[PDB]
Amino acid sequence: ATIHVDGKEYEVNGADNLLEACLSLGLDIPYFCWHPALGSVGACRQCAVKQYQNAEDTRGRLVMSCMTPASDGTFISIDDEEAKQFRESVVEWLMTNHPHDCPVCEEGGNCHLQDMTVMTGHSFRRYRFTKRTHRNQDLGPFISHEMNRCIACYRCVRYYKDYADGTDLGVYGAHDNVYFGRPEDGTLESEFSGNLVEICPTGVFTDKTHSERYNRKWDMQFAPSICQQCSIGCNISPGERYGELRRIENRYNGTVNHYFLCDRGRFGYGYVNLKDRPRQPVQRRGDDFITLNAEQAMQGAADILRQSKKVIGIGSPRASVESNFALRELVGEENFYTGIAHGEQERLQLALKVLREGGIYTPALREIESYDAVLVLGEDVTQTGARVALAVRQAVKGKAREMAAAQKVADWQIAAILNIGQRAKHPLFVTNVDDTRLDDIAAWTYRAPVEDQARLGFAIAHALDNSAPAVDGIEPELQSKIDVIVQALAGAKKPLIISGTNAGSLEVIQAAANVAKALKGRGADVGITMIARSVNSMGLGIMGGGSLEEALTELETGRADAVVVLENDLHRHASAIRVNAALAKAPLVMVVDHQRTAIMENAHLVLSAASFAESDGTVINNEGRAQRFFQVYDPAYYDSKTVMLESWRWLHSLHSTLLSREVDWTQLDHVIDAVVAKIPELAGIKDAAPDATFRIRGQKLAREPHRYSGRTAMRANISVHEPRQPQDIDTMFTFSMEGNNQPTAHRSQVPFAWAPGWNSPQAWNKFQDEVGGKLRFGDPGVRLFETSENGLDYFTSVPARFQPQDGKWRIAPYYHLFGSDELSQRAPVFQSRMPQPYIKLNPADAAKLGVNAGTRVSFSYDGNTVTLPVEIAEGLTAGQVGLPMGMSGIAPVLAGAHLEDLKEA
């Protein structure tokens, strides 16, 4: 299409509206109610331009650019005097009731309303009457509410209800008394409620966790990082001030997470700021805990390791690829053990084999929204891979999108699309041990044990393809439900099969692979998604190694007398008594970690490792994409006694001091080169980000904005002499403002979005190739493996149906977005959001045991009689006890296990 803006010719997409087309061209049109991910509704009336009928037209008329298609031969003017006057008048009308709040408002300096007030040129107030006022609501521990600042742009309700499918936020009242919030005080129930603080263009919805230690956007030190709280790999911009992690902002990745995070990623960062974190190397000498610097810690550890007869290393899926590789190089490949249990390792390696050998394409997180039917087997996605659940909700809305496209409705006219679609949706079928949060939009939900969910998957695969193994013993009603799923999946152009390792069942993953293979054999464009457990579960699976049980066996038999545990608490993957006994038997325990864990009491040496905020590295997400995270700040800048290094730096220096008796702190690119030289399956992590020599016209990439303040005073109380700028030899970023963050700079790692005149998250428009698309020079992160040419065979190991044995209680896993992840559950703001510990019981089982809801019952696992209160689960099948995985005292390895003597305390 061809448009003429202010007498200048432009080539645009005709299927776009004029606002997103002009913003993609670099032109500035003020806007409030439009969002790239939410569509156009034409509410705020801010985006007025003057449209002319033809070239020889001087009158024109004011139109909404967001509601006007960018059709071929379209003549508009942005800088027309009447259009500018009307846009200024719209800002002025918004300003009549706006509170005098910018100094005490958390949005200030990051506020889209401030930016558009300045952009329209409105700075003189002639309104003299009263301003309307609203009372605020309590919205829970994450979101702070201030309705005075609302401009009634309806972005919050459109995102929360129409996009995120939330139910507890709405708009109330009428005329100028419209109110946006909950129907009563309470916590916002959506797992994606935290995106309101970026969706809202004003300071109505703000980050309460950031508000506690508030600082302005210009004062932040930003880095591009990867969220560490699950396996999805959403791109984040952590921002630090005064040595503490202050905020997690969304970093736009047009391939993975685009505009949105989940609440665990956004608000679960508080473990970085915990005061009990190790900051120096500490050696246990008898009952004394002496503090070492880096060099003598390396020398003492190297001497003791040299005296040892066999050193084993226990990695973790929390640690990066480089850290796990450095531990593997320190101890040797045959002495390296993954820190996860044997069953978890089997499930993770099966998921990896399905992903990189199954011949079925695995989609990125944005690509999930383009699928026409979804079958989720076993994986409680909202509690384990939440952003996948949000993308699945978008894929469900795809049917209304297609129906509206059949009626020649433009794809941005979202209200017309929703009106045409009504309650029609693409088919979604979820299976779990109980109800999920996707049940509101799912075409069907199967509440069954993991064996029965696997049998349902195998039956679906057999009915799709007769070469798949059959299932004997399916009831006719379950058969009818299976047939419903089969005709929904067979008639889909793009079916998607989602599973993962969190169900605790190998057979669930096998059944999902069988369904995907059966759909691939019929010629469908089938995709498969595997949800892993942790941020680098897939990287640890690719690297490989022995299980934690084998490492504990080596420690117990005395074959290994030295153990180096990297970033692993070891209690989530094995019983605490066995771990404690094996670690007490070992004459040397060294723990390299950034969190004070329970195994540090028996540790002979503790190395103060860096968390993700203080370290660089690579993590492989659930789709196999290698992504680099960069260090946010120097931990030694304020506290000069802090010796907190990257885990790979500690382990490389330990290996060098063990070999040549000399220290070697090395560089990140050297470790990455060693990884890609030694492990060819991880060769793609080299191209996840450019090396430390990368420059934009000779200059590095700035971590902090150009208006960063307090350089000669932030450390003045410690010393009036300003310290040296922290040097970054590892990456291409600099720990200063003296660098490049231009939106036109040829790079893919953007620490934060800022453009002149766009101080809010709307500056990501300037950083994109087209608005709502990808980053201008490509989204960061590369895929490790391509889709294989040939697939796997059908898995013939169809399990038998679940049978409740008397006196034995099968543990059904229950996951929680707030509580199941280890580091995020250590965050203090999550404790209020955390559910109270519980045990779920069937009504028949609770009546048989003579217990009601709330009564405290006790059970013994690995010789630990623990007591929990009972709540009644309607959807749980009898013979099962529902336990909250990943919580304190309940390890995630308990999923699929069995319970004895479960009786009332």
CB 617 within 8 A of CB 600: no
Query: What is d(CA 205, CA 36) in angstroms, rounded to the nearest whole number?
Result: 19
Among 24, 46, 51, 97, binds ligand FES (CB under 6 A): 46
Query: What is d(CA 245, CA 616) in angstroms, rounded to the nearest whole number?
Result: 15
The pair phi, psi for residue 247, each rounded to 5°, is -150, 155
Q: How distant, in Å, are the alpha carbons of 743, 749, 780 from that of 775?
A: 9, 9, 8
Nearest to 784 by CA among 356, 473, 389: 356
722 binds another protein (CB under 8 A): yes
Cβ at position 13, least distance to another protein in Å: 23
640 binds another protein (CB under 8 A): no
Nearer to ligand FES, 47 or 78 (CB): 47
Stretch that binds another protein, among 189-197, 330-338, 706-714, 796-804 (CB under 8 A): 706-714
Nearest to 36 by CA among 7, 61, 56, 16: 16
Cβ at position 102, least distance to ligand SF4 in Å: 3
From the list another protein, Ca ion, ligand SF4, none, which binds 122 (C-beta under 5 to 8 Å, kind-based)?
another protein
From the list another protein, ligand FES, Ca ion, none, which binds 45 (C-beta under 5 to 8 Å, kind-based)?
ligand FES
Cβ at position 649, least distance to Ca ion in Å: 8
Among 23, 47, 199, 565, binds ligand FES (CB under 6 A): 47
Cβ at position 32, least distance to ligand FES in Å: 5
Among 58, 724, 789, 807, binds another protein (CB under 8 A): 724
Cβ at position 125, least distance to ligand SF4 in Å: 13
726 binds another protein (CB under 8 A): no
Cβ at position 769, least distance to another protein in Å: 16
Find the binding residues for another protein in span 187-216 (CB under 8 A).
216
Q: Which residue is nearest to Ca ion (CB)?
A: 730
Cβ at position 169, least distance to ligand FES in Å: 20
Query: What is d(CA 513, CA 511) in angstroms, rounded to the nearest whole number?
Result: 5
Enumerate binding residues for Ca ion (CB under 5 A). Answer: 616, 631, 730
Nearest to 364 by CA among 540, 493, 529, 539: 529
Cβ at position 616, least distance to ligand SF4 in Å: 18
Amino acid identity at 294: A
87 binds ligand FES (CB under 6 A): no
Find the binding residues for ligand FES in span 13-32 (CB under 6 A).
19, 31-32
From the list ligand FES, ligand SF4, another protein, none, which binds 551 (C-beta under 5 to 8 Å, kind-based)?
none
Query: What is d(CA 62, CA 269) in angstroms, rounded to the nearest whole number?
Result: 47
Nearer to ligand SF4, 185 or 769 (CB): 185
Q: How distant, in Å, are the alpha carbons of 19, 27, 33, 114, 358 from that of 30?
A: 9, 10, 10, 11, 48
Enumerate binding residues for ligand SF4 (CB under 6 A). Answer: 98, 101-102, 105, 107-108, 111, 113-114, 149-156, 180, 199-204, 227, 229-230, 232-234, 261-262, 264-265, 385-387
Find the binding residues for another protein in span 112-131 (CB under 8 A).
113-115, 117-118, 121-125
Nearer to ligand FES, 731 or 768 (CB): 768
From the list another protein, ligand FES, ligand SF4, none, which binds 44 (C-beta under 5 to 8 Å, kind-based)?
ligand FES
Cβ at position 756, least distance to another protein in Å: 4
Nearer to ligand SF4, 95 or 674 (CB): 95
From the list ligand FES, Ca ion, another protein, none, which binds 685 (C-beta under 5 to 8 Å, kind-based)?
none
Query: What is d(CA 507, CA 229) in angstroms, rounded to the nearest whole number?
Result: 26
Nearer to ligand SF4, 109 or 541 (CB): 109
Helix (H), strand (E), coil (C) string for 453-491: HHHHHHHHHHHHCCCCCCCCCCCHHHHHHHHHHHHHHHC
3-class DSSP assignment, residue 520 = helix
Question: What stretch of H or E contains 629?
Answer: strand 625-629
Among 27, 64, 355, 626, binds ligand FES (CB under 6 A): 64
From the list another protein, ligand SF4, ligand FES, none, which binds 698 (C-beta under 5 to 8 Å, kind-based)?
another protein
Nearer to ligand SF4, 50 or 182 (CB): 182
Helix (H), strand (E), coil (C) string for 176-227: HHCEEECCCCCCCCCCCHHHHHHHCCCCCEEEHHHHHCCCCHHHCEECCEEC
Nearest to 895 by CA among 567, 631, 504, 364: 504
- In terms of Cβ atoms closer than 10 Å to its own Cβ (0-12, 13-18, 19+), residue 803 is exposed
State the DSSP code for 103: G
Taking the mean position of all CA atoms in its chain, how far away is CA 238? 13
Nearer to ligand SF4, 506 or 688 (CB): 688
Nearer to ligand FES, 31 or 637 (CB): 31
Nearer to another protein, 15 or 95 (CB): 95
- The string of DSSP letters for 729-756 reads SSSSEESSSSSB--TTSS-S--S---BT
Find the binding residues for another protein in span 269-288 (CB under 8 A).
none
Cβ at position 631, least distance to Ca ion in Å: 4
Nearer to ligand FES, 22 or 518 (CB): 22
Nearest to 606 by CA among 287, 332, 291: 291
Question: What stretch of H or E contains 450?
Answer: helix 450-464
CB 135 within 8 A of CB 88: no
156 binds ligand FES (CB under 6 A): no
650 binds ligand FES (CB under 6 A): no
What is the β-pairing status of strands 880-884 and 808-814?
parallel
From the list another protein, ligand FES, ligand SF4, none, which binds 261 (C-beta under 5 to 8 Å, kind-based)?
ligand SF4
Nearest to 42 by CA among 173, 149, 155: 155
Fill in the per-residue mask, 92 to 111: x = in contact with another protein (CB under 8 A), - = not in contact: x--x--xxxxxx----xx--
The pair phi, psi for residue 89, each rounded to 5°, is -65, -35
Which residues lie across from 445 on neighbouring strands?
Answer: 430
Nearer to another protein, 8 or 175 (CB): 8
43 binds ligand FES (CB under 6 A): yes
What is the β-pairing status of strands 733-734 and 617-620?
unpaired
Cβ at position 328, least distance to ligand SF4 in Å: 25
Q: Which residues bind ligand FES (CB under 6 A)?
A: 19, 31-34, 42-47, 64, 66
